[PDB]
Design a protein around this ligand. Structure first.
Ligand SMILES: CCn1c2ccc(C[NH2+]C)cc2c2ccc(-c3cc(C)cs3)cc21
Ligand SMILES: [Zn+2]
Length: 198
């Protein structure tokens, strides 16, 4: 399959992501490394991702998430749940069981199987921050481990977040690597130390 762009693009509205500072304790379930631009999270646990803009986008703007393989030798392969997890009957009533990325707690989430690339994505309406908040947060879930045999099978992935108009045209783009693993805090510490030693 052709490869969706991963180029960072703030666009007219100054679109970019933000992440909490969750630390690296052994018990943490989701933690983001700015040094690696990499999110580490446990299977099916809440991943808060912030959306920031410098100016207000139009009504009907949407926010799409899609996963691709990071390594060039795998980027053309569709990222999907493994043969076990696609059959484990953990449906939330909305997400197709094949989709790796879900949006949690948003009844307006829509799930796309692209008729040409076969790639999966989940899209929600863009919403302004709640009163008293400075940004909007989407809660994502990743529904397979990076290690799942027959699926990601240890290959690193990226999540691409696109801000879109009501037709699906590009308004902004950002991205981050993801590792879905049992101990995100330890793995973040290990990978950050590996980077320093490099
Ligand atoms: C990207 C999320 N988002 C924001 C994130 C951060 C800030 C800055 N706060 C300091 C403002 C907005 C904002 C304003 C309007 C809208 C929308 C308007 C119509 C549909 S969404 C979305 C918005
Ligand atoms: Zn799996």
């Amino acid at each position: 399959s052709s490869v969706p762009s991963q180029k960072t693009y703030q666009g007219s509205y100054g679109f970019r992501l933000g992440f909490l500072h969750s630390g690296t304790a052994k018990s943490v379930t989701c933690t983001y490394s700015p040094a690696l631009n990499k999110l580490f999270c446990q299977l099916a646990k809440t991943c808060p991702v912030q959306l920031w803009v410098d100016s207000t986008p139009p009504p009907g703007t949407r926010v799409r998430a899609m996963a691709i393989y990071k390594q060039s030798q795998h980027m053309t392969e569709v990222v999907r749940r493994c043969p076990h997890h696609e059959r484990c009957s953990d449906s939330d009533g909305l997400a197709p069981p094949q989709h790796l990325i879900r949006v949690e707690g948003n009844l307006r989430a829509e799930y796309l199987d692209d008729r040409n690339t076969f790639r999966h994505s989940v899209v929600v309406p863009c919403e302004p921050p709640e009163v008293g908040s400075d940004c909007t947060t989407i809660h994502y879930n990743y529904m397979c481990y990076s290690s799942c045999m027959g699926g990601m099978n240890r290959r690193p992935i990226l999540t691409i977040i696109t801000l879109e108009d009501s037709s699906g045209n590009l308004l902004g783009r950002d991205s981050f690597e993801v590792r879905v693993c049992a101990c995100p805090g330890r793995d973040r510490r290990t990978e950050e130390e590996n980077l320093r030693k490099k």
